[PDB]
Scaffold this motif. Structure first.
Motif, mmCIF file in Angstrom:
data_model
loop_
_atom_site.group_PDB
_atom_site.id
_atom_site.type_symbol
_atom_site.label_atom_id
_atom_site.label_comp_id
_atom_site.label_asym_id
_atom_site.label_seq_id
_atom_site.Cartn_x
_atom_site.Cartn_y
_atom_site.Cartn_z
ATOM 1 N N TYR A 194 -3.738 5.459 9.114
ATOM 2 C CA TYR A 194 -2.289 5.358 8.876
ATOM 3 C C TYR A 194 -2.024 5.773 7.426
ATOM 4 O O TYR A 194 -2.805 5.457 6.539
ATOM 5 N N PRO A 195 -0.891 6.440 7.161
ATOM 6 C CA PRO A 195 0.170 6.833 8.099
ATOM 7 C C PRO A 195 0.084 8.236 8.690
ATOM 8 O O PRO A 195 0.826 8.562 9.625
ATOM 9 N N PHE A 196 -0.812 9.062 8.170
ATOM 10 C CA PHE A 196 -0.896 10.442 8.636
ATOM 11 C C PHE A 196 -1.806 10.711 9.822
ATOM 12 O O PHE A 196 -1.757 11.790 10.416
ATOM 13 N N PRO B 289 -2.114 -2.656 8.710
ATOM 14 C CA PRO B 289 -1.607 -2.867 10.073
ATOM 15 C C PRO B 289 -0.925 -4.202 10.356
ATOM 16 O O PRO B 289 -0.307 -4.371 11.416
ATOM 17 N N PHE B 290 -1.016 -5.142 9.428
ATOM 18 C CA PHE B 290 -0.452 -6.466 9.666
ATOM 19 C C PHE B 290 1.002 -6.673 9.278
ATOM 20 O O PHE B 290 1.613 -7.675 9.653
ATOM 21 N N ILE C 2 -8.770 -3.999 11.254
ATOM 22 C CA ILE C 2 -8.449 -2.865 12.106
ATOM 23 C C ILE C 2 -8.669 -1.565 11.362
ATOM 24 O O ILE C 2 -8.094 -1.365 10.283
ATOM 25 N N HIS D 46 -8.256 2.466 10.798
ATOM 26 C CA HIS D 46 -7.119 3.352 11.033
ATOM 27 C C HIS D 46 -7.078 4.491 10.022
ATOM 28 O O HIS D 46 -7.874 4.539 9.079
ATOM 29 N N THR E 48 -6.836 -2.897 1.945
ATOM 30 C CA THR E 48 -7.256 -1.703 2.657
ATOM 31 C C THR E 48 -8.600 -1.281 2.046
ATOM 32 O O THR E 48 -8.696 -1.046 0.838
ATOM 33 N N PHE F 271 0.840 -1.187 0.000
ATOM 34 C CA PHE F 271 0.000 0.000 0.000
ATOM 35 C C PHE F 271 0.874 1.234 0.000
ATOM 36 O O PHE F 271 2.035 1.188 0.397
ATOM 37 N N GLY G 111 -7.994 -1.977 7.544
ATOM 38 C CA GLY G 111 -7.031 -2.928 7.018
ATOM 39 C C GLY G 111 -7.533 -4.325 7.330
ATOM 40 O O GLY G 111 -7.902 -4.610 8.476
ATOM 41 N N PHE H 32 -9.944 4.266 6.919
ATOM 42 C CA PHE H 32 -9.548 3.028 6.267
ATOM 43 C C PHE H 32 -9.780 1.868 7.209
ATOM 44 O O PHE H 32 -9.844 2.040 8.424
#
Lengths: 219, 219
Positions: free
Chosen positions: B215-217, A216-217, B211, B213, B142, A190, B192, B190
């Motif tokens: 991520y990443p910001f 996340p994995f 999960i 989230h 995702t 990603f 995941g 998002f």
């Protein structure tokens, strides 16, 4: 992570774009500075023909370079490996109201500056928030990256922010192709993006942050 | 994060599915156990009619409940708020070779057990790796989550693993709708995913981890 001698920690960029949206031809030119390994970049542009643009700059922001992505140590960086040599990409934009656009870009490296040449063709219903120039930026997104026939494929379910808080979907389907065979191909992953644009008349400022990951994995 | 009294740390699940793929009717039934706040679940299923399935179980795995997603403190959990009351969803599957499927599910809660009832209709070219039962699982993905008219919308550019290392694209487009108005709607985010299935004759074991989230910001 992947490291390439011609990809320096600080690099410059030059841009030239010719495009046509609903028959309206235009030209945009500019320059920028980027930090390839940090996945950060700043760009300043000027509409040199067909300005002020009658449509939303959000249509063009993602057209103005995946080599400017922070890659972790565990995922091969296809994009930095494209240099020296260079690469190209083509992105299809499929808007929820039937709007459609195709952009193409060629990215080469002269010295310590990325030379970015692009074109875009788009057709939209007059009611589209893109044509009415009323979208308020792209929400942060996640692009799915896969490999096929030596090229990277990216899929991103992108969304534009609208007045009143709603959203407008646009699927991005992109193919990124190195001019030379890439020896270290990555597995699927990603890329998380965050892009912002500010238009003042015919002058535009763009900033993009991009980080590759398997959150996340983490595989 | 979002907490709901009827959503317990450990819950049970019951499943019933009726479906038809390329005219082949079948029925699948089973049960499972999940940890809603950990975003984990284990399911065991039996093909009770039309088995052994002539097509890839990967087509059905994601049909057999977003309430089983770990949500962080900063993103409202729409799915757990669906209870009590229940919710439904409809997912469109658009395969790269033109294959197409539509699945629908109704999820209710009786005691401490989620009651999951679903149906699926699919049409595929005989050459599809789904029809030849030769896909090797979904890659971790995702899903992009947005809100529209009180419902959650999910877009996922999913990919199936193939013999020889290649991949097969399948776009998931889902709408999740609570039976009652959800008071705390989340912003776009998002989720995941990581799903695995193992088929042994007419018995199948499924596991999903999910999960939510930004991520990443992280917004």
């Amino acid at each position: 992570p992947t490291m390439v001698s011609v990809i320096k920690p600080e690099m410059k960029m030059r841009y030239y774009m010719d495009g046509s949206v609903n028959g309206h031809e235009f030209t945009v030119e500019g320059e920028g500075t980027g930090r390839p390994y940090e996945g950060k970049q700043k760009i300043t542009l000027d509409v040199t023909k067909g300005g002020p643009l009658p449509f939303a700059f959000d249509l063009l922001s993602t057209v103005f370079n995946r080599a400017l992505t922070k890659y972790p140590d565990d995922i091969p960086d296809y994009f930095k490996q494209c240099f020296p040599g260079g690469y190209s990409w083509e992105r299809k934009f499929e808007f929820e109201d039937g709007g459609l656009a195709i952009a193409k870009a060629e990215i080469s490296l002269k010295g310590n500056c990325f030379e970015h040449k692009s074109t875009i063709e788009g057709t939209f219903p007059d009611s589209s928030p893109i044509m009415q120039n009323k979208t308020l930026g792209w929400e942060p997104s996640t692009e799915k990256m896969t490999v096929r026939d030596g090229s990277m494929k990216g899929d991103d379910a992108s969304y534009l922010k609208l007045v009143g808080g709603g959203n407008h979907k646009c699927y991005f389907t992109t193919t990124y192709t190195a001019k030379k065979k890439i020896p270290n191909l990555p597995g699927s992953h990603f890329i998380g993006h965050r892009i912002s644009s500010v238009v003042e008349g015919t002058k535009i400022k763009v900033m993009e942050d991009a980080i590759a990951h398997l959150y996340p994995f983490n595989g």
